[PDB]
Design a protein around this ligand. Sequence first.
Ligand SMILES: *C(=O)[C@H](Cc1ccccc1)NC(=O)CCCCCN
Ligand code: CL
Ligand code: CL
Ligand code: CL
Ligand code: CL
Ligand code: CL
Ligand code: CL
Ligand code: CL
Ligand code: K
Ligand code: MG
Ligand code: MG
Ligand code: MG
Ligand code: MG
Ligand code: MG
Ligand code: MG
Ligand code: MG
Ligand code: MG
Ligand code: MG
Ligand code: MG
Ligand code: MG
Ligand code: MG
Ligand code: MG
Ligand code: MG
Ligand code: MG
Ligand code: MG
Ligand code: MG
Ligand code: MG
Ligand code: MG
Ligand code: MG
Ligand code: MG
Ligand code: MG
Ligand code: MG
Ligand code: MG
Ligand code: MG
Ligand code: MG
Ligand code: NA
Ligand code: NA
Ligand code: NA
Ligand code: NA
Ligand code: NA
Ligand code: NA
Ligand code: NA
Ligand code: NA
Ligand code: NA
Ligand code: NA
Ligand code: NA
Ligand code: NA
Ligand code: NA
Ligand code: NA
Ligand code: NA
Ligand code: NA
Ligand code: NA
Ligand code: NA
Ligand code: NA
Ligand code: NA
Ligand code: NA
Ligand code: NA
Lengths: 142, 132, 156, 172, 337
Amino acid sequence: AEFDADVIVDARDCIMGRVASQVAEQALDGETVAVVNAERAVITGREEQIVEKYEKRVDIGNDNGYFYPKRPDGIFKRTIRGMLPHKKQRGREAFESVRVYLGNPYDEDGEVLDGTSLDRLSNIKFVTLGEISETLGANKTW
Amino acid sequence: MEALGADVTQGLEKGSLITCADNTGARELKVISVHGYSGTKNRHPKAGLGDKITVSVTKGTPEMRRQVLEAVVVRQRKPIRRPDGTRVKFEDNAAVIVDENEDPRGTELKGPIAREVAQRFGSVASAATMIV
Amino acid sequence: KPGAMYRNSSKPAYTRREYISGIPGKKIAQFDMGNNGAGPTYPAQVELVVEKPVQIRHNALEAARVAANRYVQNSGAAANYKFRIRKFPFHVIRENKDGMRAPFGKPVGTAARVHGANHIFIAWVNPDPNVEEAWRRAKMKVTPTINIDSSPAGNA
Amino acid sequence: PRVELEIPEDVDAEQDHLDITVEGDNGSVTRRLWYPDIDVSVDGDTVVIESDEDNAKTMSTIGTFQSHIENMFHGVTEGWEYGMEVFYSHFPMQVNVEGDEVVIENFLGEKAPRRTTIHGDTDVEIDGEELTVSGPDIEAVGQTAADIEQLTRINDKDVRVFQDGVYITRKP
Amino acid sequence: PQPSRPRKGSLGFGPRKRSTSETPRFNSWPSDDGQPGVQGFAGYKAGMTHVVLVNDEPNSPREGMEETVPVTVIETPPMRAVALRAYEDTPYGQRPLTEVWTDEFHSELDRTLDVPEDHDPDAAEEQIRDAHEAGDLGDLRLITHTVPDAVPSVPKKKPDVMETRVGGGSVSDRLDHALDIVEDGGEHAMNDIFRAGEYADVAGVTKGKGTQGPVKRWGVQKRKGKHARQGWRRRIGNLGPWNPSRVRSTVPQQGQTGYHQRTELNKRLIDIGEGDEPTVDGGFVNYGEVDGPYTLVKGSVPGPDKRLVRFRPAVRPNDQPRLDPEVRYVSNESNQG
RNA sequence: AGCCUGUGUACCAGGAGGGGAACAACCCAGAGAUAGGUUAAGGUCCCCAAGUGUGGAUUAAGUGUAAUCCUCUGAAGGUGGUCUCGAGCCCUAGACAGCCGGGAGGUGAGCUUAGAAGCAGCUACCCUCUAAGAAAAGCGUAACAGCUUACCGGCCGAGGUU
RNA sequence: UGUCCCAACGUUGGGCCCGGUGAACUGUACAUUCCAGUGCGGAGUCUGGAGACACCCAGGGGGAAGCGAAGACCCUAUGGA
RNA sequence: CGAGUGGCUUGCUACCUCGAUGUCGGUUCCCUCCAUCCUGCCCGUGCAGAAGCGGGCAAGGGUGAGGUUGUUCGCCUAUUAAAGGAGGUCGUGAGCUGGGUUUAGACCGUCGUGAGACAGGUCGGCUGCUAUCUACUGGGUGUGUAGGUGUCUGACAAGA
RNA sequence: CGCCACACGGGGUAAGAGCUGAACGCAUCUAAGCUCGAAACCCACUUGGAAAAGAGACACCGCCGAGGUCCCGCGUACAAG
Ligand SMILES: *C(=O)[C@H](Cc1ccccc1)NC(=O)CCCCCN
Ligand SMILES: [Cl-]
Ligand SMILES: [Cl-]
Ligand SMILES: [Cl-]
Ligand SMILES: [Cl-]
Ligand SMILES: [Cl-]
Ligand SMILES: [Cl-]
Ligand SMILES: [Cl-]
Ligand SMILES: [K+]
Ligand SMILES: [Mg+2]
Ligand SMILES: [Mg+2]
Ligand SMILES: [Mg+2]
Ligand SMILES: [Mg+2]
Ligand SMILES: [Mg+2]
Ligand SMILES: [Mg+2]
Ligand SMILES: [Mg+2]
Ligand SMILES: [Mg+2]
Ligand SMILES: [Mg+2]
Ligand SMILES: [Mg+2]
Ligand SMILES: [Mg+2]
Ligand SMILES: [Mg+2]
Ligand SMILES: [Mg+2]
Ligand SMILES: [Mg+2]
Ligand SMILES: [Mg+2]
Ligand SMILES: [Mg+2]
Ligand SMILES: [Mg+2]
Ligand SMILES: [Mg+2]
Ligand SMILES: [Mg+2]
Ligand SMILES: [Mg+2]
Ligand SMILES: [Mg+2]
Ligand SMILES: [Mg+2]
Ligand SMILES: [Mg+2]
Ligand SMILES: [Mg+2]
Ligand SMILES: [Mg+2]
Ligand SMILES: [Mg+2]
Ligand code: NA
Ligand code: NA
Ligand code: NA
Ligand code: NA
Ligand code: NA
Ligand code: NA
Ligand code: NA
Ligand code: NA
Ligand code: NA
Ligand code: NA
Ligand code: NA
Ligand code: NA
Ligand code: NA
Ligand code: NA
Ligand code: NA
Ligand code: NA
Ligand code: NA
Ligand code: NA
Ligand code: NA
Ligand code: NA
Ligand code: NA
Ligand code: NA
C-alpha cells in the first residue's frame, strides 16, 4: 500500500530476466522500483521444459526448507533477489526498495525498459508468468 | 464375498486347532491360511466365522490325517455382533470340511451353526441340524 | 571379453612368434571369397574403409567377414563377384588372468592393426551393388565407424 | 514469400490482429493464425499470406494457413459433411442425438450409455443406420465425426471379431 | 529381506501441537446451490446412547428392519447471528470489508466482546452494496455466537463466537437474506439449517491427553520379546540413518497428543428434537441432564463432553439424503453400570 | 585406476599476488616498503569492475552458457529436424505428384494338368490395332471374376528427381 | 502361558515442580544450520545456494567419522618375554 | 560380433583413518531410486472368449505369514492383486539382540619330532558414558511489526 | 479385541488413440493449431500457518482508563510454563 517508486516498470510482454537485471542494477543505485503486471511478464522457451524447472523448485525442500513462490508475484521478486547480494546490508536495502505487483495499482502506466520487450508477432515459443503460476497450482487472483 | 450380515472379531489364527463339525473322519483341524486374506508385517493371519480357510487334519482317521483340505468356520468362542447390537458366541471353535464347490465333504454336521454362515454357504447350511 | 580391452593401439607391436608361444589359432575362415579363380576384371569395386586406427580381434574379423559374405548370397553360392579381407591379425594380445604382481599376461588371442583410412575389405561386382549392403552389415561388427567407398564406378 | 487467395463472391472475410473470420450463407468461422513473421491480411478482394522468410519451417505454415483459409471459404458456402454408418452384429446399437451430444446405448449390450459432446455449430442428423455430420467449421465437424467413431473404440477384445460401432463412411 | 510396511501414523494432521482455538474453525464451506441459508450451526457435546432405527437404506437387504445405532447426544440450543461480515476479492485473496451489527444483544455477550454502543448499520450496508455494484464482493458470512447459559450442564456463560458462511441463490438475494436474519436479533436454530436424515461435517477439538509417547501418539510397536526386558519398552529403534546426519521431522517422537482440531466428515443427523427424551438415567456421566433443543449424531464426535462442536452441511457426501429416519427406540438406560 | 615402475623438462614440496565458484602443482605471474599509472591471464546482463558493443550467420535443444580435469561423459548405430555447397539427369515440344479417361484384341498363348485362362510348375515370349497396353510387375480366385503396376491421352502449370 | 498376534489398564519407586546439599566427564578457537559441491578421496567453519528473531523447559539419542583407551588385528624394529 | 550404462556382486589399487570411524545377520524407525512384481492407463499377439505371453507410460499406494539354517542368500508350504529389486558408512550397537565370525578353557579329524597349526568341525565364553553443541518432536518467555477485545485472511507448509 | 468417519468430480499431461494440416499438389496424429487420454501432476478435502521484514484485514471498545496480570473456587487443560 503506497510505495513512492522513483520508477514504475511495466513487465507486460517483457523478458523477466532482462527486466530483473535492470531493476536490480537500479535498486543498487538507490532507486525505488515497482514492477507492474507481473502476471503478464514472459520468458522464452519450450513451455514444457520451463514448467518442469519451476515445478522442480516447488518440490525441492526439507525441514530446513526451500520456500519457492508459485504466484507470478513472488516468482518475479525471487528472480530479482537472485541478482542482488540480498544478505549484505546494501543488498537487502536495494531488494527491500523493490516491489512487484499483480496488475497495476498505480495511476501512471509504467514505462517499458529498453531491450526487454518481446514481439509476439515474431515469437511463438514463450510463456506467461501467470500461465506458469496456474500450472504450479496458484490461485488465479488476477 | 457376500455380507455376513454381522460383524466378526476373528477368534482364530494360522496355526489354531479347531473342531471339525462333521462326520468326514477328521476330528481336529489346524488352520493354515485364510482365503482371500492378506495381513500386514508381523501380523498373524486371522480367521473367524464365515471365512473359508485352508486346513490340515491333525486328528482323525489315518486316511484323513495329514491331508490339506478346505473348510468353513461355523463356530467361534469370540463374540460377534448382530444388526440389533446383541453379541453371539459359541461353546467352541469349529469348521466343516468343504470341497471345490463348497459342498460339505461329509454327510452330517455335528453341533449348531451360526445363521450368518447360511448367507454364504448354502449347501453347508442346508445340511445343518441346528441353525442359531 | 569386451573389445574395450584390446581395441587401442597403445601397446608396443607384439608379433615375434620366435619369442611368443601358445598363440591361439585364428578364427578367420578365408580371405579370398567368391570367384577367386577370376581376377579383378569387374566394372565396380567397392571398399570398406576404417575411419580410425584400431585393433580388430580375429573374433570381429570373422564375424564381420561372415556377416558380409554370408549375405553376399543374394547373388548365390557361386555368384559372380570376389570378396577380399586384406588384413591379417598379427598382433598377439595378452590378459593378466598374484594380482598386479608378475602381471605380464598370457597369450589369449590375436588382432589386426588397421589405420584410419585403410580399406579392410574390398569387393568386386558388376553393376549389382548388393555388396554395399553386405558392408552395412560388416562395419556393424567391428569397433570403428566406417566409410563404404566405391572406386571404379561412374555408373550412378 | 507471398500467396494471394481470391475470396469467393459468396463470401466476406474480415480480420483484426491474428484472428480471421469468414462468413457465408452457410455460416461463419473464425480462426487464429499465429506464427513467427507470417502476416495474414484481407486486401479487399483477396486474403494475403506473406513473410520475409523462406526457410522450410515457414513455408510449411504458409501452406497450412492457405488450406485453412480455403477450407473456411468452402465451409461458409458449400459446407462440410461426413457420412457415418452405425453397425452391430448381435446387440442393436441405438444412436440418438440428445442435447448437444450424441448418445449411444446398448453398445455390445452395455447398460451404461456411451456419449460424446458435439463441437461447435456441427449438425449431427441421424436417419436409420446412417449419420451425417455437417457444419462450416471443418475442424469442429471433423472432430465430432471422429469422436463419434472413437466413442465405440474397444481395446479389451479382438476388434476383428467385435466390429460393432459407428464408422466414417464418406470423407468430404 | 525386511518386509515392507506403511509408516506409523498419518503425516497429514500436523504439526501435532495444541490447538489455537478451542472453538473449531472450518476451512471449507458447502457449495452455493439451493436457497440462501447459513451454512452451519453449533452445540455442546453431552454423551452417548443407542437408538433402534428402521433400516432406511434402499440398497440394504435389511431395509425396513430394526437396527441398533450408536448416537452422540449434542445439545443444540438456538444461536444468534449478531452481524453480517462482507469480504472483497483482491490480488491477495479475500479480505474483510465491513460488518453490519445490531443493537439487541444477549445479556452476557460482553463476557467476550466489547459490545458495540455506537455503530452505523446503513453505512456498512451501503459500502457492501457499492462493493457488489463494482463486483468486488467476495462471499458473505455471519458472526455467530452460542448461548451456554441456555445449557445448564455446561459451566460457562461466556459465549463462544464463530463466523459462519452464508451460501444462497444470487449474491444479492443472499446478501438480503443475511441482513434480514441479523436485523431481527440473529436468533436461529438447528431446524432452520439441518433436517434429520441429512449428512453433516462435525468439527471439534479432540480430547487432550497432554504429552504421550510414540507408541500411543503414533502407533509404533513396543519393543518385542527379549528387547522388551533390556531397558527399552516404549522407545523406537532409531532417530534415523547415519546420513542424512539430522533427525527428520517424519520420525515418530513424543509430544502433545490430543486437543487438536478435526473435521469429521459425513456424519448423519439421526434426529433433531427438544426435551429430555434422549437423556440417560442417573444423568450423562460428567455432564448432566438433557432437556431442551438437541441433535442426535450418528456415531462419535471429536472432543469431550461439554466441548463446543460445529456442524456444517456435508461438503463431500457419498450418499443421497434419506430424510427423517424412523426412530423406534431411544435408550435412556443409565450409563453407570 | 586419484595403479605400479622408468625417462626428459617445468613446477608443488619450499612459491606470494591475479584468474579458475571452492582447489599443492592449469592459466598470468616469480615478490623489499609506500605511491601514481598501464597491462597480463581472465572478463564486460545482474550478483561483479567493464558492452544488454558492431557487421553477419547458425541453433529451438535451455542444445549451450563446462580450456585442462578422479572432477567437464556420452558411444557404436540412426535422423525428409534444419541450414549451406557440389554433381548428374528430366522439364512450357508441359516435367514430378495428384485426379479423370484409356489399359485393346489373335488369345482363355503352348506345355503339362480333370483343371490352369498374366500370375502352381516348365518353355517361349511372338504381331495386330494404335496415341497407349507385358505371352504380365503386385494382390486376388478352387480355377474364373474382381483390384491395380507397367505403358498412352487429358486436366493442371513450374520446377523436379537422383 | 502377554514370547508373539497387539497392545491396555493398574501398583510401588523414580522421573516433573519446590527447600536444602552439591560433584564428575569434557572444553584449540569460532559455532542458528540445511542441500549440493570441493578438499589428503567421509566438511557446522572452504565454494554456491537455501534457510535462519533471541532466550528458556521436557524428550528420545540422527550427527559432531560424539566421550572413554598412544589399535589387543596386520605389518615394521638387526624390540621383549 | 560390436557399442555402452550402472556402481548391487567379485576382483584390482593402497589415496584416507592404526594417540581405534565398534563385526556379520536380525530387529526397530525414517527417507529415497526405478532397471515395475501387483494396481491405473496403453501397444502388439502365433489377440474368438476366458486364461496368457511380450512391450510402453508410470514410483501414488501395496509387496504380507510361516518350516530347516546364525545366515545374507537360498530351499520348501499355504495364503495373495502381488507376495519386485536396490541406495542411505554393505542406513540403523552414545537403539536393541549377540546366534555366527574373531581372545583366553576343551574335544575330534588332519598336519608337525615338538611347542603348536588348520575361512575344517564342535561345546563354553563380557556389550561402558549423567548430552556441551548441533538435529528434530512437543512446551514456554521475550523482542520486532506499534493501546485492547473478538472475528478473519492465506504467502506458504504437510498428507496416501 | 469394541464403535463411527475417510469421495466424486473438475484442469493439465505421459504412453497411446485420433482431428485438421504443410513442408513434399498426394500422403502424414505434428512441423504451427486441435480433440482425448494414467492409481501419476494440479485443484478439490483435512491439518498448521501474522515473524509473510510488503511483519496483514475487519468490527467494536479504549487512551484516565479499555483491557490485562496477580488473587480466590475449579477443570472440557496440564511434566514447569
Ligand atoms: C579381525 O577382524 C579382528 C579379530 C580380533 C582381533 C583382536 C582380538 C580379538 C579379535 N577384529 C578387529 O580387528 C576389530 C577391530 C576393531 C576396530 C574398531 N575401531
Ligand atoms: Cl521445504
Ligand atoms: Cl548476499
Ligand atoms: Cl518462436
Ligand atoms: Cl497364510
Ligand atoms: Cl523390538
Ligand atoms: Cl623467483
Ligand atoms: Cl532453463
Ligand atoms: K585403523
Ligand atoms: Mg516378523
Ligand atoms: Mg482376452
Ligand atoms: Mg542387555
Ligand atoms: Mg457405563
Ligand atoms: Mg449393561
Ligand atoms: Mg617438505
Ligand atoms: Mg558494473
Ligand atoms: Mg545441459
Ligand atoms: Mg574435455
Ligand atoms: Mg554458506
Ligand atoms: Mg598405537
Ligand atoms: Mg597377534
Ligand atoms: Mg625372544
Ligand atoms: Mg561413532
Ligand atoms: Mg521407465
Ligand atoms: Mg514415493
Ligand atoms: Mg551397515
Ligand atoms: Mg536396510
Ligand atoms: Mg548409532
Ligand atoms: Mg554399544
Ligand atoms: Mg548410553
Ligand atoms: Mg556368541
Ligand atoms: Mg552355537
Ligand atoms: Mg583362523
Ligand atoms: Mg559357539
Ligand atoms: Mg531488531
Ligand atoms: Na529463458
Ligand atoms: Na520448494
Ligand atoms: Na604370489
Ligand atoms: Na562400428
Ligand atoms: Na539397561
Ligand atoms: Na530391564
Ligand atoms: Na553408527
Ligand atoms: Na620453484
Ligand atoms: Na581462486
Ligand atoms: Na541448460
Ligand atoms: Na504383563
Ligand atoms: Na545424538
Ligand atoms: Na561403467
Ligand atoms: Na585417529
Ligand atoms: Na546389524
Ligand atoms: Na509405485
Ligand atoms: Na526361512
Ligand atoms: Na560404519
Ligand atoms: Na549389529
Ligand atoms: Na552393544
Ligand atoms: Na486426468
Ligand atoms: Na504481525
